[PDB]
Design a protein around this motif. Structure first.
Motif, PDB file in Angstrom:
ATOM      1  N   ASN A   1      -8.077   6.438   7.618  1.00 58.96           N
ATOM      2  CA  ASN A   1      -8.971   6.864   8.456  1.00 58.96           C
ATOM      3  C   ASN A   1      -9.700   5.723   9.454  1.00 58.96           C
ATOM      4  O   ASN A   1     -10.076   5.775  10.536  1.00 58.96           O
TER       5      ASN A   1
ATOM      6  N   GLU B   1       0.883  -1.337  -0.078  1.00 56.72           N
ATOM      7  CA  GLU B   1      -0.165  -0.085   0.129  1.00 56.72           C
ATOM      8  C   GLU B   1       0.949   1.147  -0.023  1.00 56.72           C
ATOM      9  O   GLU B   1       1.043   2.023  -0.866  1.00 56.72           O
TER      10      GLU B   1
ATOM     11  N   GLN C   1      -0.268   9.031  -4.884  1.00 56.12           N
ATOM     12  CA  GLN C   1      -1.881   9.061  -4.606  1.00 56.12           C
ATOM     13  C   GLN C   1      -2.101   8.187  -3.268  1.00 56.12           C
ATOM     14  O   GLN C   1      -1.922   6.968  -3.083  1.00 56.12           O
ATOM     15  N   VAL C   2      -3.122   8.764  -2.445  1.00 55.61           N
ATOM     16  CA  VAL C   2      -3.137   8.012  -1.346  1.00 55.61           C
ATOM     17  C   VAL C   2      -4.942   8.034  -1.069  1.00 55.61           C
ATOM     18  O   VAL C   2      -5.476   8.903  -1.673  1.00 55.61           O
ATOM     19  N   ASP C   3      -5.632   7.265  -0.073  1.00 56.05           N
ATOM     20  CA  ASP C   3      -6.922   7.056   0.059  1.00 56.05           C
ATOM     21  C   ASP C   3      -7.140   7.259   1.491  1.00 56.05           C
ATOM     22  O   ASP C   3      -7.025   6.240   2.228  1.00 56.05           O
ATOM     23  N   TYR C   4      -7.641   8.448   1.959  1.00 55.87           N
ATOM     24  CA  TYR C   4      -7.635   8.611   3.275  1.00 55.87           C
ATOM     25  C   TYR C   4      -8.463   8.043   4.258  1.00 55.87           C
ATOM     26  O   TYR C   4      -8.643   8.288   5.438  1.00 55.87           O
ATOM     27  N   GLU C   5      -9.639   7.628   3.791  1.00 57.04           N
ATOM     28  CA  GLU C   5     -10.697   6.799   4.563  1.00 57.04           C
ATOM     29  C   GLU C   5     -10.500   5.416   4.546  1.00 57.04           C
ATOM     30  O   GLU C   5     -11.226   4.540   5.050  1.00 57.04           O
ATOM     31  N   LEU C   6      -9.187   4.991   3.667  1.00 59.63           N
ATOM     32  CA  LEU C   6      -8.683   3.651   4.179  1.00 59.63           C
ATOM     33  C   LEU C   6      -7.834   4.193   5.430  1.00 59.63           C
ATOM     34  O   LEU C   6      -8.350   3.310   6.599  1.00 59.63           O
TER      35      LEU C   6
ATOM     36  N   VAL D   1       2.761   4.590  -3.239  1.00 61.02           N
ATOM     37  CA  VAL D   1       2.421   5.984  -2.993  1.00 61.02           C
ATOM     38  C   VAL D   1       3.480   6.575  -3.238  1.00 61.02           C
ATOM     39  O   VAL D   1       3.341   7.852  -3.616  1.00 61.02           O
TER      40      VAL D   1
END
Ligand SMILES: Nc1ncnc2c1ncn2[C@@H]1O[C@H](COP(=O)(O)OP(=O)(O)NP(=O)(O)O)[C@@H](O)[C@H]1O
Ligand SMILES: [Mg+2]
Length: 846
Positions: free
Chosen positions: A714, A698, A707-712, A702
């Protein structure tokens, strides 16, 4: 529009059949569930609606005198009891004197005539919400009213619900959980009254043991508020599969019934009545079936309030259970047994994902994650007996406690079915050292996506320099020498675990070296009462550069530096790469240094070592001398002495690879933190430590593509949070199961353990005087005291039910506790003392 712009507006009232999804922000917890609970098939929920929080926001959070106050309250802390009492009184009365806008009171009339109307009795129950926090609970925090009839009296109680949001007990609860007032609203649920013959709580798990395959029920005569109320007792049934499998019948001496003209009264029950089985076995099952259906609609174990009115069961609440340690998703059929490596490693703190990745990517064994900790599936070892015993015998020696848990699994019945040379140790340790020096030099030039591509290389080098088949042979050579030496010296001289005394002050133990050296650090500080006074006080992470200010220490500093070069990379919890190291925050080391000074004499490195040797060497000759006093005498003693020499030669290396390993971890951790540091500068990450929540891959992609997915991220944090509250078993089960006469008063077990101490409290909780090291005994217990009892070691109450308050909270605080005892308040005279245990339900005199 074409809907008169009528049309992007929040409503004031919503029917259980109207409630949309994730509008929790409108109708709150109890409401959003009631709603969803309606839409189930084959389930009878009474009808009703919710006074939406809009009604609260418009009536009460849009009042200047109100907001002025809430502001005055945001000022106080728990230490300030009276201000709270007073302000609460004031705020509370302002609400019961702030009329509801005629506008809203007319929507209500409209719906409520659909359910209907003002001649029918209703339930006014309060469902609350915390903004931008849908997974917060106010279980048992606010008021509720049964059997309210009439408009004049409906509005009176809607206002008394809002008021129930400002009780000290509620206020103080938000202070402790830092929820913010002004950020908490209240919806009010208006629901049809059920005049039931019987009502109670149900769990689609077992409260104790989290079985997941066994349902438990708590039932009584009358209205439910009594049970939740705290006195009366209840009936407890347990159902596994479709079979009733326990029946505790209680003495329900009270019940609560509706009045034709509103309200509620409490009736003593005729004696013959008080021992009756409040559900009939056909209903117990008929009920369990329900709880199972619901659980299936939600997809998780639920907590249910139910009613029995002319045969019929009505569901009047549902909830999830929050206290269950989760289950790994192993795609392997049947009944399986997982063993905690948390407990083996002696950690059982949750581990963040980056750290979990690393533990995983270096072992080749197959492990599972559950609850933020690690587990090993050991199910197949338990099939073939040649290997079952072959197992339990191994754990039986180390992790003896783990074994006991294991054995209880073994007979639930229903459940299942050469030695490298002396040059070795040396070479091994050297090359680990040299490998680590290249690694040090090599990583400081690496960066970007290279850096990740880098440490993928190194994780093989690591496995290669640290876990050779030479290294393992060396580790095992020492350990196998202990096994042999322990049983064979049991069987000839009758002395167990002699390998412990023979192992003392054995060379090359890397951890044992470390603890000695930290004894000397401590020793440097004793001459200078200046330092020790400082260190004892300072909560400064750089207390360190403030050391040469005082010469009373300041040698103290050159000491700490030398020790932190050879060991700064360790910490309690080293196995999680994410954890803070000693060299990182030196303040985490202080307390030991301090505790050494308190509990050891100066120069104890010198003495404790020596007396280690002399005693391992006089136990060497006491053995051998005593051995040749028997048959085959000279050959046994001859036999053991090779074993001892194998022991002391290899035993200290046992400890090396983990040190060799976390040493490389730390090097990784730091280069891995530069990358993160950089990522923030680049604008991709908010905090540089926001990587501890990405797994390795993961993360790795990045820094390749930014690119990152922040409600992963969170949810990860939100969940890591939820699991820190949890305490892993030594044995987890495919079914979620958690594993590990004397003039006696019988009760309900409720909560596992055994403790001893103090007396009964009547107790004027309101003016209650408690004390440390004591067991509690009232008869009624309810949430009113939840925020009052940390100091307790054990609980016993007259009132019964295993999902009462006494139970569910004693079960979380970890106290053993028995409820349902016959007359405990009486019968345990004068607040004296006692011994209780809760794995079974008994209570006795000391
Ligand atoms: N419409 C109804 N008819 C009959 N009994 C009801 C009805 N609604 C609720 N009850 C029962 O009366 C009590 C209502 O209290 P309620 O506040 O809803 O639960 P609580 O445990 O006291 N507080 P909470 O933790 O927020 O749910 C419970 O015992 C319910 O089982
Ligand atoms: Mg309830």
């Amino acid at each position: 529009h074409h809907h008169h712009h009528h049309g992007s507006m929040k409503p004031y009232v919503l029917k259980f059949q109207e409630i949309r999804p994730h509008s929790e922000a409108l109708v709150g917890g109890k409401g959003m569930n009631l709603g969803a609970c309606s839409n189930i098939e084959g389930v009878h929920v009474p009808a009703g609606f919710c006074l939406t929080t809009e009604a609260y926001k418009r009536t009460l959070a849009e009042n200047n005198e109100f907001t002025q106050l809430l502001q005055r309250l945001s000022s106080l802390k728990t230490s300030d009891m009276d201000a709270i009492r007073e302000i609460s009184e004031t705020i509370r009365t302002l609400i019961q004197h702030t009329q509801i806008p005629s506008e809203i009171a007319s929507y209500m009339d409209a719906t409520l005539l659909d359910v209907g109307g003002y001649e029918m009795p209703f339930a006014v129950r309060s469902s609350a919400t915390a903004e931008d926090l849908p997974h917060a609970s106010f279980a048992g925090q606010h008021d509720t009213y049964l059997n309210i009839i009439g408009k004049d009296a409906l509005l009176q109680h809607i206002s008394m619900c809002w008021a129930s949001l400002f009780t000290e007990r509620a206020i103080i609860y938000r202070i402790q959980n830092q929820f913010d007032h002004r950020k908490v609203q209240l919806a009010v649920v208006i629901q049809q009254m059920i005049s039931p013959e019987a009502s109670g709580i149900l769990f689609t798990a077992d409260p104790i043991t989290s079985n997941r395959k066994s349902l438990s029920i708590d039932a009584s005569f009358g209205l439910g508020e009594a049970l939740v109320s705290g006195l009366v007792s209840a009936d407890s049934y347990t159902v596994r599969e479709n079979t009733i499998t326990n029946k505790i019948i209680a003495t329900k001496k009270l019940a609560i019934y509706s009045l034709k003209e509103g309200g509620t009264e409490t009736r003593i029950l005729e004696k013959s009545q008080q021992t009756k089985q409040t559900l009939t076995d056909q209903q117990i099952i008929q009920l369990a079936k329900l709880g199972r259906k619901i659980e299936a609609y939600f997809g998780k174990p639920q907590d249910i309030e139910w009613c029995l009115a002319e045969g019929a069961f009505y569901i009047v609440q549902s909830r999830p259970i929050t206290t269950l340690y989760p289950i790994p998703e192993v795609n392997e059929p049947g009944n399986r047994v997982y063993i905690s490596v948390a407990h083996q490693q002696m950690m059982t703190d949750a581990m963040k994902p980056l750290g979990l990745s690393f533990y995983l990517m270096t072992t080749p064994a197959t492990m599972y994650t559950a609850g933020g900790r690690l587990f090993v599936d050991i199910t197949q070892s338990l099939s073939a007996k040649v290997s079952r015993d072959m197992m339990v015998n191994s754990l039986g020696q180390s992790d003896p406690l783990i074994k006991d848990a294991l054995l209880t699994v073994i007979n639930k019945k229903g459940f299942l079915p050469s030695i490298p040379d002396s040059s070795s140790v040396f070479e091994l340790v050297r090359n680990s050292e040299n490998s680590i020096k290249h690694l040090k030099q090599s990583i400081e030039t690496k960066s970007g996506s290279d850096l990740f591509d880098f440490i993928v290389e190194d994780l093989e080098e690591l496995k290669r320099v640290l876990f050779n088949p030479t290294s393992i042979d060396a580790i095992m050579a020492g350990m196998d020498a202990s096994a042999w030496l322990n049983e064979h010296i049991y069987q000839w001289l009758g002395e167990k675990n002699v390998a412990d005394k023979l192992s003392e002050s054995a060379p090359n133990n890397i951890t044992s070296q470390m603890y000695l050296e930290l004894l000397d650090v401590a020793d440097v500080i004793r001459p200078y009462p200046a330092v020790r006074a400082y260190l004892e006080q300072t909560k400064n992470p750089d207390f360190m550069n403030e050391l040469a200010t005082l010469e009373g220490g300041a040698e103290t500093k050159k000491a700490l530096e030398d020790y932190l070069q050879k060991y700064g990379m360790r910490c309690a919890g080293e196995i999680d790469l994410t954890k803070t190291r000693w060299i990182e925050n030196p303040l985490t080391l202080i307390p030991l240094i301090l505790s050494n000074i308190k509990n050891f004499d100066s120069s104890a490195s010198m003495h404790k070592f020596a007396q280690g040797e002399k005693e391992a060497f006089h136990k060497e000759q006491e053995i051998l001398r005593r051995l040749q006093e028997l048959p085959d005498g000279e050959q046994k003693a001859m036999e053991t002495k090779e074993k001892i020499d194998i022991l002391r030669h290899f035993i200290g290396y046992r400890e090396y690879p983990k040190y060799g390993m976390i040493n490389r971890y730390f090097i990784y951790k730091l280069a891995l933190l530069r990358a993160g540091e950089q990522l923030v500068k680049d604008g991709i990450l908010q905090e540089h430590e926001d990587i501890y929540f990405l797994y390795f891959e993961e993360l790795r992609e990045v820094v390749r593509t930014g690119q990152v997915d922040y409600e992963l991220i969170n949810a990860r944090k939100r969940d890591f949070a939820t699991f820190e509250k949890l305490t892993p078993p030594r044995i987890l089960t495919s079914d979620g199961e958690m594993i590990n006469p004397k003039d006696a008063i019988l009760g309900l077990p409720v909560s596992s353990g055994t403790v001893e101490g103090r007396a009964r409290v009547i107790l004027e909780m309101e003016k209650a005087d408690l004390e440390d090291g004591d067991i509690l005994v009232t008869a009624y217990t309810d949430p009113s005291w939840t925020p009052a009892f940390v100091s307790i070691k054990g609980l016993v109450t007259e009132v019964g039910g295993l999902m009462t308050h006494g139970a569910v909270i004693a079960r979380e605080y970890g106290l053993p506790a028995v409820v349902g005892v016959e007359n405990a308040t009486t019968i345990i005279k004068d607040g004296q003392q006692i011994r209780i245990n809760g794995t079974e339900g008994y209570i006795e005199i000391l």
